Every structure is written in structure tokens, then in C-alpha cells.
Amino acid sequence: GWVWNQFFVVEEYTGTEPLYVGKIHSDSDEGDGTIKYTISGEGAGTIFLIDELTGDIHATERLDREQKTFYTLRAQARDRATNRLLEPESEFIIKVQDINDSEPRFLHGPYIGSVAELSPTGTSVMQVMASDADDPTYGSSARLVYSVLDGEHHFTVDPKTGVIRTAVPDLDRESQERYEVVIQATDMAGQLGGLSGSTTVTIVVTD
Amino acid sequence: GWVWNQFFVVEEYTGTEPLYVGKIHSDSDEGDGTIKYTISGEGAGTIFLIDELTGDIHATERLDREQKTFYTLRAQARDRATNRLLEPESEFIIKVQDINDSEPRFLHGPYIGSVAELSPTGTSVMQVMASDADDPTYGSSARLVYSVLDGEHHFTVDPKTGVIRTAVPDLDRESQERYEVVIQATDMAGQLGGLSGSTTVTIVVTD
Ligand SMILES: [Ca+2]
Ligand SMILES: [Ca+2]
Ligand SMILES: [Ca+2]
Ligand SMILES: [Ca+2]
Ligand SMILES: [Ca+2]
Ligand SMILES: [Ca+2]
């Protein structure tokens, strides 16, 4: 069947006034105040507070999807005069939504490789893989694009794979044996506003 | 029973990235892509757009609660190869939540009242009622507070009922027969950041 028992909440909420999660409600509620809505479970009475009359739920402190992706709660509908149930206690999930708040990070450094001297232009040297803690299944918050600096005219980098390639063929080891190239990974598919990380890759020329 | 088939969307959203409304989903979804989620009804395919792969719904334009408070839609789950649905098309509502973006306005103004000369201090003259197009059932966005301007020491106004009253007992008609008093209604229960409107009330001293 269709899945409806859910609420969505943005993570890392910036406002002062509590964030509105939603509203649990019973189709028996005629709108007179005889029903008492109460919640329980993860974050109940701490993170999420409910208005026992209206059913409105609010988040009182910010949420982090990289820490916890969903909260499982239960909802009860009491009679305000007798505190007895008018609806079965029902599980409902609060899904916290991803935002691009995780920068790309090169976690496997120091990155060092080697390539033979006088190699052809386009020779695969090594590969670097940055990581992004955001949600890859929703939006480009974790879709990365690798690049070099504009003032780097010895090597290039594939944009989406991050494999380093030589940009010049006349690399004689005697003139200069060691190069330090910086690589940049940017999320949001490289569009402006995308977060970025960087690493220093040392590449050394062999015979 | 519990009402769950709903999504909540804040009105007057100004940002660039489309707003996330929610996600329709079938527990029959094995997560392989053989499912085609589609939307119909109010705002379907124009205001609200859906991702057929995941089911995520987005709002493509700013919403206005004072224009429309909720949108009634239908959700379908088709098979990607046969276009025969595996769940009955289910109605679901997108309720747009209120923000304090409507100023108080005196719509039955500007009218006129009377008070007998030499009346005691605190004599009820008349009542003024401002209106607020925001949601009165949620927040103080429509809870108003009436007030006078600084340096108005002839009449007062109750902050909650808005009934004007004499502030002085020495109202001699011969000395001054007519007063133009300004009344101001402010929402958010008067707290800073509350919107305001005003009207000019002519009060006249009688015998
Ligand atoms: Ca986070
Ligand atoms: Ca990111
Ligand atoms: Ca994130
Ligand atoms: Ca509006
Ligand atoms: Ca208002
Ligand atoms: Ca409003």
C-alpha cells in the first residue's frame, strides 16, 4: 500500500522559532477540543513537542542527517475528559532531509604517484577519490567534479573520475624529478556555491 | 482513524532550489526502478512536479496561503514496462502553512463616534476591529493588539478589544468639539517584528 505515515524535516535548521514538523490528526476530531494528542518514542518530549489540542508538532533543536536519518515515534489520541484512546497508537516516522553541508574530503592522503619520463601526453599517473558525507541519492549535494588550478600546465585531471594524466610529453627526469600538484573536488557538480576540498599530490618522475 | 496522506509546505518561499514537498512511496517498491510514480490533480505537472524514479515531489513556484490553503491531488504507482498500476490511486492533500505576511487592515473604517462632554475618565466611546488575513488558528500571526500614537493624551484604546475610552475627564465641548484619533493594530501580539495597520477615527463631543 501507499506509505503516508511520515513527516519531513530539514536538517541544520537556522531559524529561532521552532520548526514546524506537521500535524497528527484523527478524522474523529470535530474541532471542539475534546481530543488530546500525545506523542512518544525517539525525541519525544525533547526534540519534538506537540500541541495536545491542535496536533501541531514542532522541532525544538536542530537535526543532523549525518548523525541520524529518521526518528520513529508513536501517536496517541486520547479523550481529554477520560484520557482513554480513540485511535490505535500508531507508529510514524520523521524523516530528516539532506542539505549540502558536507565538504568534499580527501581522506586517503598523502597522495603520491609515479610516471615514467618522456611518457606520451595523457598517461594515467594515479587516481584520487574524494568523499562527500551528504546524500548521494537526492540532489547533487554529493556529486563531485575534480579539477586542477588554472596555473597548472604539467598535468590534467578527468573531471568525474579524478584520474591524473600528464599534459606535456617532454618530462625529462634530469631537469626536474618531483612535482607537487594540488587537486580540488567540488560538489553540486561544480556549479557556483558548491563546497570544495583539496589535497596536495606529490608526483615523482622515474627513468 | 489517523490522517496521514498529507504534505506540508511553507508559503511565500523565495529560495532558488525548488521546495521539497515530500515523497509518495509504495511498500511494494523493491528499489529497482520498475515503478513509475505519477501525480494528477490540482497543480499536478505545473506547480508540483514529481520524480518518477524516487517519488520525490517539488514545488516549482512560490505558494500563497491567502490565495489557496491546500491542493488536492492523486498519486499513482505504475509499472515501468506495462503501465498498469500496482496500488489504487490515492488522494493526498498538500497543505501550505501560514506565515505572518498580511498586515492588519481596518476594513469597516474609517468611522465616527461620540462621547458626552465632561464624561468620566475611562468612558467607553466605540469599538474598532482590524482584520488580519493570516491564520488565526496557528501562531500569533493574526492575534492583534490595538494602541494609540505617542503623544495622544485625550483617548486610550484597550489593547485586546480595541474599544476607545476617554483618557481625561475635562472634555468641554465649547473648548474643543472634535478630535481625530489614530488607532493602530499590530499582530504577533505586539512583539517586535509584528506587522501594523492604522486608521483615523474622528471622535466628537456631544451634550
Ligand atoms: Ca549535517
Ligand atoms: Ca557535499
Ligand atoms: Ca548533509
Ligand atoms: Ca501570503
Ligand atoms: Ca498578520
Ligand atoms: Ca499568511
From Swiss-Prot, chains A, B:
GO cellular component: plasma membrane
Induction of its expression: Down-regulated by thyroid hormone.
Disulfide bonds: none
Domain of life: Eukaryota
Subcellular location: Cell membrane
Record key words, sorted: Calcium, Cell adhesion, Cell membrane, Glycoprotein, Membrane, Metal-binding, Repeat, Signal, Transmembrane, Transmembrane helix
Main localization of the protein described in the UniProt heading: membrane
Gene Ontology process terms (BP): calcium-dependent cell-cell adhesion via plasma membrane cell adhesion molecules; homophilic cell adhesion via plasma membrane adhesion molecules
Domain Cadherin as annotated: residue spans: 2-106, 107-207
Tissue: Predominantly expressed in brain. Abundant in olfactory bulb, cerebrum, and cerebellum, less in pons, medulla, and spinal cord. Low expression in heart. No expression in lung, liver, spleen, kidney, testis, stomach, intestine, colon, and placenta.
Glycosylated position list: 100
Keyword Ribosomal protein: no
Gene Ontology MF term list: calcium ion binding
Domain remark text: Three calcium ions are usually bound at the interface of each cadherin domain and rigidify the connections, imparting a strong curvature to the full-length ectodomain.
The protein's role, per its UniProt record: Cadherins are calcium-dependent cell adhesion proteins. They preferentially interact with themselves in a homophilic manner in connecting cells; cadherins may thus contribute to the sorting of heterogeneous cell types. PB-cadherins may have a role in the morphological organization of pituitary gland and brain tissues.
Name of the protein: Cadherin-22
Classification lineage: Eukaryota, Metazoa, Chordata, Craniata, Vertebrata
Positions spanned in the full protein: 60 to 266 of 813
